[PDB]
């Protein structure tokens, strides 16, 4: 027996599968169980032998993909591709909710850097979604004392106390009095999607000289970051400005369209990293093209 567990951001599904079972068969069963149709955004995340977080290929069997061995196999049904604008592209409520929960968790886990002012505004939309309108009676002082509202990095510059924070969030909850639940989630996603680290797939790489760098893959192309600045790219490669991309084993090369510009060469720890980089490039480029036809 092959026990597998797939979690969405708010559901947990446990399946028994077979050695012949494909990721697509698992993917489609999760998808119709929760009733989602905007499937192009999503995938089945897992951790592999080496402790890398990657995505299941749906065309290959679940067993042939080096998934970490644990009695319940662990898959996270998650957004794998991110729209250029959530307002135009996330239609179903199930899609919007799953994006909202996933993005909020990443922000709360300090995986996406977020200024404190934006963080409190984000927290206010989250409480308007969960609690509905602030009501003077049923929401007496201290009603968010047990809610996880802000990322810890924001707390570490602790000019405010744990109670001063909640009072300022409370203030902004009041300003959202008319807002319905789904629109509250969408306003959260509208703000969150403009953070610089939002929707970026980060890969640890090195240049030819051995200097460590980051490689970002997002909806608009490729970015090179210095190892100690993951916010602002030092080189940017939008799709329209790339002549070709390539890899051979560990060596990866980006050639810009300029023609006088030199290629950018970087090196991955192993071939599977470069394969995963390219797969995300192909997925993001295709959605990019499909948005413009």
């Amino acid at each position: 027996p092959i026990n597998v567990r797939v979690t969405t951001m708010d559901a947990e599904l446990e399946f028994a599968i077979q050695p012949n079972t494909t990721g697509k068969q698992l993917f489609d069963q999760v998808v119709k169980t929760v009733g989602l149709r905007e499937v192009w955004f999503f995938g089945l995340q897992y951790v592999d032998s080496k402790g890398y977080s990657t995505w299941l290929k749906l065309n290959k069997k679940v067993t042939q993909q080096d998934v970490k061995k644990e009695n319940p196999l662990q898959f996270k049904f998650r957004a794998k591709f991110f729209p250029e604008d959530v307002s135009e592209e996330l239609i179903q409520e199930i899609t919007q909710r799953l994006f909202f929960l996933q993005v909020k968790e990443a922000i709360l886990n300090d995986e996406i850097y977020c200024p404190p002012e934006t963080a409190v505004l984000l927290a206010s939309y989250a409480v308007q979604a969960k609690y509905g309108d602030y009501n003077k009676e049923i929401h007496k002082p201290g009603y968010l004392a047990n809610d996880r509202l802000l990322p810890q990095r924001v707390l570490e510059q602790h000019k405010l106390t744990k109670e001063q924070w909640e009072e300022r969030i409370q203030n902004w909850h009041e300003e959202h009095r008319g807002m319905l639940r789904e629109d509250s989630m969408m306003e959260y996603l509208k703000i969150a999607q403009d953070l610089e680290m939002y929707g970026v797939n980060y890969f640890e790489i090195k240049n030819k000289k051995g200097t460590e760098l980051w490689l970002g893959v997002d909806a608009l192309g490729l970015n090179i970051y210095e190892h100690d600045d993951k916010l602002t790219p030092k080189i940017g490669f939008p799709w329209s400005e790339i002549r070709n991309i390539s890899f051979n084993d560990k060596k990866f090369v980006i050639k810009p369209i300029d023609k006088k510009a030199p290629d950018f060469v970087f090196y991955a720890p192993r071939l599977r990293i470069n394969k995963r980089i390219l797969a995300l490039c192909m997925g993001n480029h295709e959605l990019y093209m499909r948005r413009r036809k």
Binding site: V4, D10, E12, E14, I17, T21, Q29
Partner: peptide
């Protein structure tokens, strides 16, 4: 055909 069989669900609301 090797379809997965659901043996458990938890819904978190």
């Amino acid at each position: 055909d090797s379809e997965p069989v659901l043996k458990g669900v938890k819904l978190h609301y």
